Amino acid sequence: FQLAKNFSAQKRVVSYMMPSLYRLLNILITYGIIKVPTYIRKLISSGLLYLQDSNDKFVHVQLLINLKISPLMKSQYNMVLRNVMEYDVKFYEIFNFDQLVEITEQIKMRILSNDITNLQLSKTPLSIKIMVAEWYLSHLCSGILSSVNRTVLLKIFKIFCIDLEVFHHFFKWIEFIVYHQLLSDIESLEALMDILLCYQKLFSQFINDHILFTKTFIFIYKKVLKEKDVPAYNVTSFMPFWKFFMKNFPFVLKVDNDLRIELQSVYNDEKLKTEKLKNDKSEVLKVYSMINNSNQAVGQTWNFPEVFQVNIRFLLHNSEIIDTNTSKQFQKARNNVMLLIATNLKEYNKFMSIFLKRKDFTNKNLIQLISLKLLTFEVTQNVLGLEYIIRLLPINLENNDGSYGLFLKYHKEQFIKSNFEKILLTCYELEKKYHGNECEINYYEILLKILITYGSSPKLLATSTKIIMLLLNDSVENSSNILVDEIDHVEYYVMMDFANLWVFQAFTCFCIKKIMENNEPAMAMEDLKNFIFQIIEITNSNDLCSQIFDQLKDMQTIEMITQIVEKDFCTSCLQNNNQKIDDNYIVVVIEIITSL
After folding, report:
1. Most exposed residue of 41, 71, 183, 493, measured as fewest CB within 10 angstroms of its CB?
2. Closest by alpha carbon to 503, among 596, 441, 434?
3. ∠158-160-165 over CA atoms, to 5°?
4. Cα 483 to Cα 473: distance, rounded to the nearest angstrom
């Protein structure tokens, strides 16, 4: 509508959802002509000026991703009708051509900074970016030379910024797979992208070929200088494919079996020091400085120092040296796990490395588990959120996995963090992180119990009316998610607003119910429990929503206590009986009453 802050966030978020739906909807079941006819019919209604109507049509018409031949007559004509009081006004199609030229010029040579700027400029129009991606995709496919190293990360990362060509990136990756193979080090890095893909990987439906492609890479490798040949990231992906695929094939099974054995054999032969020395010598390129004795003692410090100094700047003349250093560090770790752990522990104790520098180090070689086990309070906050704006290897999975793994550690940190409340840094960050973390975390069944447990503790923990107001903050954050003294009924209405993200609502309801039930008087519970339940149910007055609310209240109560839930059912049964009792006398409103 017009000038509504609450409405705008929902509508705006709704507008982004609608744009995604338009992209997906158009590809499988949508008509360009039917959509245009509907928009034309809609303007007619808005002959009298309406602030809300004009903006929506322009916004939807602006990025419908219509075919260029079909769109020009229709889109331009539509714009002409709505030209009065329109910022875009005339020549919308020309803007698309200009945007395509800007995208193309930057893409062909350099312009890494320019590409980022182009997205910022083109944030307003989604459609222009989509057209540009196709041109970019064709150029990449045509070049005979195989993409490698940083360019692949940059090429995909840059493309990643434009939302529309999700498929294009996958197609390009497959073609790279179809095409002659790139450098081996890059290939290991490339898989990282596949791992990040997760469920989205399934959409491509090139899995049979992919297995074949993976095997082909195994067949293809010849001139590889890495003795270790670690396949853990790749082995994990193969394991996911076996579990995910749930099928047996001749080509896939033999390749998977062959890949596990080589890694096991290298680890077993890992103890021998001749292989370790030989691998180390090639990277070092000096025969005399074997450093076979106490390699962890000296090399780790060198690896720690050499890597740390140039990684942040990322201006190194040679791409080869950093990779060599990383390989050496990995080899030492593989050679002695205990020694590697000791070295990692030693580095933390020294504390000669900046927290920002440490985060970058964790992304590539350092273990998150070691950082997680022992860390500074300030460091822990830094550890939770990492900045990936600068080009870097994807670290999306480790962070995602830790978050998915537990609810007790994060809650504990927030509680400890919340108490200090000082220096306007860590404390401020912790409050933001906890709110952000809950929203970020998926409402998994296992997660919901943890979420309910934490939410209940938060609600239960507050001993003041003012804090009660603070929860208000959580609902607003949930319904926003952008980077006098009243009593129980308002809270009930707030609980009532909810659509799907019910973990918080359920926790609040459960806490309220528990408090009401525990009035310490047998007589008191009946008087309050019945009234609270009826008001909550009466206020909902609905079908699906009411069912959810009852279930949530019932579910939360049952989860907290099996017996308490049973007690609620008895109270509910008594409440139901009272409603049933009226039935003989009342003879009215059966449909509304029965459904609830």
Report:
1. 41
2. 441
3. 110
4. 15
Token digits of residue 158: 């840059």
Per-residue b/e over 357-377, b at no fewer than 16 CB within 10 Å? Answer: ebbbbbbebbeeebbeeebee
- Cα separation, 311 vs 306, in Å, equals 9
CB 102 within 8 A of CB 64: no
Cβ distance 295 to 276 under 8 Å?
yes
Q: Name the amino acid, one letter, at 540.
A: N
Residue closest to 146 by CA, chosen among 189, 114, 187, 107: 187
Kindly give, in sequence order, each residue whose CB lies less than 8 Å from that of residue 60, ignoring residues fewer than 6 positions away. Answer: 18, 22, 39
User: Any idea how long the chain is?
Assistant: 596
> How far apart (Å, rounded) are the C-alpha atoms in residues 175 and 156?
13
Contact 403, 441 (CB under 8 A): yes
Resolution of this structure in Å: 4.4
The owner of tokens 């890479």 is: 217
Whether residue 296 contacts residue 339, with contact meaning beta carbons closer than 8 Å, is answered with yes
Q: Any idea what DSSP says for residue 416?
A: H
Amino acid making up residue 593: I
Rounded to whole angstroms, the Cα distance separating 469 from 461 reads 14
Contact 75, 66 (CB under 8 A): yes
Element (H, E) at 10: helix 5-29
The answer to whether 164 touches 133, Cβ cutoff 8 Å, is: yes
CA distance from start to end of the chain: 33
Report yes or no: 268 and 370 within 8 Å, Cβ to Cβ.
no
Phi, psi of 582 (to 5 degrees): -60, -40
Place of tokens 């995602």: 400
Q: How far is CA 233 from its chain centroid? A: 20
Q: Secondary structure of the chain: what % helix, strand, coil (to 5)?
A: 75, 0, 25
Task: Write out 524-571 in H/E/C secondary structure.
Answer: HHHHHHHHHHHHHHHHHCCCHHHHHHHHHHHHHHHHHCHHHHHHHHHH
CA–CA gap between residue 410 and residue 412 (Å, rounded): 5
Distance from C-alpha of 262 to C-alpha of 268, rounded to nearest angstrom:
10
- 156, two tokens: 């995909």
Amino acid at the residue 217: F
> Treating both helix axes as pointing N-terminal to C-terminal, what angle do 92-108 and 69-81 enclose, rounded to 10 degrees?
130
Q: Residue 26, class by beta-carbon neighbours within 10 Å (0-12 exposed, 13-18 middle, 19+ buried)?
A: middle
Phi, psi of 89 (to 5 degrees): 55, -135
Q: What value does the CA radius of gyration of the chain take, rounded to a whole number of Å?
A: 30
Contact status, residue 104 vs residue 135, Cβ threshold 8 Å: yes
Q: What is the DSSP string of 190-254?
A: HHHHHHHHGGGHHHH--HHHHHHHHHHHHHH--S---SS---HHHHHHHHHHHHHH----HHHHH
CB under 8 Å to 105, separation ≥6 — which residues? 111
Q: How many CB atoms lie within 10 A of CB 108?
A: 9
> Taking a C-beta distance cutoff of 8 angstroms, is the pair 395, 361 a contact?
no
Tokens, residue 582: 């009226």
